[PDB]
Amino acid sequence: MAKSYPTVSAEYSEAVEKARQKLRALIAEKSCAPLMLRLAWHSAGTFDVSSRTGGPFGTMKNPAELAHGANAGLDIAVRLLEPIKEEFPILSYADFYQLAGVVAVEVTGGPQIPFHPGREDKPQPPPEGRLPDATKGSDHLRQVFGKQMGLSDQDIVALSGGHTLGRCHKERSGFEGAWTSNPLVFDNSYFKELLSGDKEGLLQLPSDKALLSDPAFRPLVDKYAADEKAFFEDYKEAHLKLSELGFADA
Ligand code: HEM
Ligand SMILES: O=C1O[C@@H]2[C@@H](O)CO[C@]2(O)C1(O)O
Ligand code: NA
């Protein structure tokens, strides 16, 4: 009941469904689901509840936001998706990029995340510096996900499981390597690799390791490593919340 979703036209809803189908095909065919999940997350994760600035309002299309250091490489994702966007002028970029994130999780075998249309494209990007710093720890994660975005500790641990997709690139973040042996498969392997310690061929960031030493985060890592269904349930809830920060609040 925390949300009151806007009414959109039948034509808007039809465009969402047709765009979903085109996104499913493109993301699968080009093997770019991890990049598209990162696009949606960096679009949404800039929300700050105290000022109600940032969040999933289409501003990743803005070259000034693409130039943020944390967003290196997301210009590739924006350009890959633009041919589909041009077929759906009625849709906001805000909705379109969050739909891409939902589809990315779907096509890699993850949960079905609900999607509610109607986000506005806002003119001003957030200030640079809202997103989490991979070199920091649990206090920082709580400041960013908790105090800025308004999400819970469970949400932090479940959303970190998104690193079951993809990898770090030396020219983008500067880190290099994949978290899992199956970077195009959405499963609970991220938590299993965390628990087993470091191993050759795989990467862990300091922010990942912070989940192991924190007394509230660690039981959730244990849970998700043992129970993929529980991970999918909590991930679905957290991604839905993330994708709607600042949107349709009652
Ligand atoms: C918890 C704090 C987080 C930190 C510190 C963090 C940091 C990073 C870094 C440094 C990269 C590498 C970028 C590159 O070099 O290409 C990355 C990639 C990625 N992030 Fe995270 N991230 C966090 C949370 C999340 C969340 C919440 C999600 C989505 C639910 C997510 C999804 C991804 C994905 C899928 C990739 C791989 C992208 C690709 O393969 O192109 N991350 N993240
Ligand atoms: O998801 C992704 O799409 C890119 C594609 O080139 C293959 O791997 C990538 O570099 C990626 O991980 O960013
Ligand atoms: Na994986």
Do 51 and 129 meet the contact criterion of CB atoms below 8 Å apart? Answer: no
Domain 10-129+240-243, CATH 1.10.260.40 — does that match?
A: no
Q: What angle do the packed helices 10-30 and 93-107 form, to 10 degrees?
A: 50
Q: For residue 224, how far is its CA from the centre of ligand 3 (angstroms)?
A: 14
Angle at the Cα of 144 from the Cα atoms of 42 and 64, rounded to 5 degrees: 35
Which ligand is nearest to the Cα of residue 76, counting in written order? Answer: 2
DSSP letters of 166-217?
-EE-TTTTS--EESSS-TT--SSHHHHHHHT---TT----HHHHHHHHSTTH
42 is in an annotated binding site: yes
By the 8 A CB rule, do 165 and 33 touch? yes
117 is in an annotated binding site: no
Query: Cα separation of 95 and 3, whole Å?
Result: 16
Q: Is 114 helix (H, G, I), strand (E, B) or coil?
A: coil
Q: What is the dihedral of CA 189, 230, 16, 116, to 10 degrees?
A: -140
Q: What is the experimental method?
A: X-ray
Give dist(CA 83, CA 65) in Å, integer: 20
Ligand 1 centroid, distance to 192 Cα (angstroms): 17
Nearest residue to 41 via CA among 250, 206, 240: 240
Supply the residue whose CA is at minimum distance from atom 13 of ligand 2.
35
Could you tell me the CATH superfamily of domain 138-239?
Answer: Peroxidase, domain 2 (1.10.420.10)
Query: Does residue 35's CB lie within 6 angstroms of at least one atom of ligand 2?
Result: yes
Task: List the structure tokens of 210.
Answer: 């912070």
Atom of ligand 2 nearest to the CA of 172: 13
Atom of ligand 2 nearest to the CA of 73: 13
Q: Is 42 a catalytic residue?
A: yes
Ligand 1 pocket mutation, candidates 30, 35, 36, 41, criterion most atoms within 8 A of CB: 41
- How many whole angstroms separate alpha carbon 180 and alpha carbon 203? 8
Take residue 158 and report the two structure tokens written for it: 């479940």
Q: What share of the chain is helix, strand, coil (3-state, %, to 5)?
A: 55, 5, 45
Token pair listed for 9: 């036209």
Residues of the chain with CATH 1.10.420.10: 138-239
Say which of 42, 68, 140, 239 is annotated catalytic: 42
Record the resolution, in angstroms: 1.5
Where, residue-wise, is CATH 1.10.520.10 in the chain?
A: 10-129+240-243
What's the rounded Cα separation, in Å, for the pair 80 and 132?
A: 25
